[PDB]
């Protein structure tokens, strides 16, 4: 009797390759291909939460690197002046604070990370990582995220009080009603 498997007995078995951004590797190895991978993983579309949002185009694994919050690192004491300059030119300001003395300015050289909306029940979180003496802000998935789902994280604004309150439209059952 003939057997289709007789020639396969010694062959390498194949399966789906796991993306480096998703694997249990040191950060620099995961980060190396984040830019290319992110362009495949996510896109900017109209959102039911607010204006435009970032959405999943292709399943994202739990704990995988989604996208870097790209921009130029500046000192914390430059922000105010920069905000006034942009405001005076009709330019939308986008920044993400790294620590007390450093901030990422995504206004002029940012990417799609700028469009991530807030949610009181998020599916993403963020981390600061150092690669080659350079600080980067990286967004990770808290859970498996599926094609079509909106990516959100918790802005966790310091609780203002009055008035001063900005309403939240995240639509989560556990919504806090205000962004602050």
């Amino acid at each position: 009797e003939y057997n289709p498997n007789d020639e396969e007995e010694e062959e390498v078995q194949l399966k789906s390759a796991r993306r480096a951004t998703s694997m249990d590797l040191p950060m620099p190895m995961r980060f190396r291909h984040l830019k290319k991978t992110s362009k495949e993983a996510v896109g900017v579309y109209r959102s039911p939460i607010h204006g435009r949002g970032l959405f999943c185009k292709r399943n994202i694994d739990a704990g995988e690197m989604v996208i870097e919050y790209a921009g130029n690192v500046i000192r914390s004491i430059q922000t105010d002046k920069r905000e006034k300059y942009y405001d005076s030119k009709g330019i939308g300001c986008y920044m993400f604070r790294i620590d007390d003395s450093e901030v990422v300015d995504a206004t002029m050289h940012g990417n799609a990370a700028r469009f991530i909306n807030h949610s009181c029940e998020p599916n993403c979180y963020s981390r600061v990582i150092n690669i080659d003496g350079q600080k980067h802000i990286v967004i990770f998935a808290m859970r498996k995220i599926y094609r079509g789902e909106e990516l959100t994280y918790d802005y966790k604004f310091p609780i203002e009080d009055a008035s001063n309150k900005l309403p939240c439209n995240c639509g989560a059952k556990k919504c806090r009603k205000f962004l602050n």
Binding site: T79, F96, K156
Partner: peptide
């Protein structure tokens, strides 16, 4: 509004 650091 500059996204905060306590975010991390």
């Amino acid at each position: 509004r500059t996204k905060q650091t306590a975010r991390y």
